[PDB]
Symmetry: C2
Subunit: 153 residues, 2 copies
């Protein structure tokens, strides 16, 4: 439990949150784990009615896929390693951005992105507000038409 | 008002059956026909409950829904009069367009992304959603090309 307001957080507060937490390894160091081949390691660092905070440990094999967070704003802090944040572009020229250790970014609830290209041993802290309850997972058929599946997580 | 429908969700086929049968019963919707001189596309509610939403839409040639999805709602359209253009997005910009003319209908599942543009003034269509259309995702494109989905409450 942290000293946060009794409400949903905007993306500026979420960014400060992931960084403040990166600066307190005492609360996330023990949850680091790189499954040799299970699923992308999730570790709840704090969950309440207003915020979900996760620690993610990445293998080179991990990819979120194109997705959105419905109504949830979000922030990411790379603790170690580096991630690839891609934002969709109609036309196929998808904007791609390498986010290196020490760096962080945030976004509002309308964000569509994909996290991948994780160098082995990468560690990141992800916070969502309101809590992440439903996501939209996009897919493109062989023909080219795009879909959005609402999923539970 | 309210239609006498089952107390459960309807699938795509049932939603298409519904909009087609309502077209054949103008007593249920003829009175709600209206084409705004100005003030946004006209929507009139025919039925809203915990399982199904039904709307009558009256189109002017300018009207446009924009690119959007229906979250978890399956849906169906019947064009009663005139015609609409049903566009489906394509990464590349070559969006798939399809004129839906009077008498014609189509259904879709919850994963559908589309845009409907009124093709002719005086067009009228019936739209049904199950589960109810209480949340809608409206897509936008910045000149950078980056696309974003704004979730909206339509309940
Ligand atoms: Mg709390
Ligand atoms: Mn995400
Ligand atoms: Mn629609």
């Amino acid at each position: 439990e942290l000293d946060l307001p009794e409400r949903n957080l905007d993306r500026r507060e979420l960014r400060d949150l992931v960084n403040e937490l990166a600066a307190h390894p005492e609360r996330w160091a023990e949850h680091v784990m790189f499954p040799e081949e299970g699923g992308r390691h999730y570790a709840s660092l704090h969950r309440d009615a207003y915020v979900d905070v996760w620690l993610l440990c990445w293998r080179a094999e991990d990819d979120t896929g194109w997705h959105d967070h419905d109504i949830s704003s979000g922030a990411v802090r790379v603790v170690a390693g580096a991630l690839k944040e891609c934002n969709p572009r109609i036309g196929g020229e998808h904007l791609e951005t390498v986010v290196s250790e020490g760096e962080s970014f945030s976004f509002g609830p309308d964000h569509i992105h994909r996290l991948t290209g994780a160098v082995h041993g990468s560690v990141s802290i992800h916070a969502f507000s309101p809590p992440l309850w439903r996501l939209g997972q996009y897919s493109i058929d062989d023909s080219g038409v795009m879909r959005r599946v609402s999923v539970s997580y």
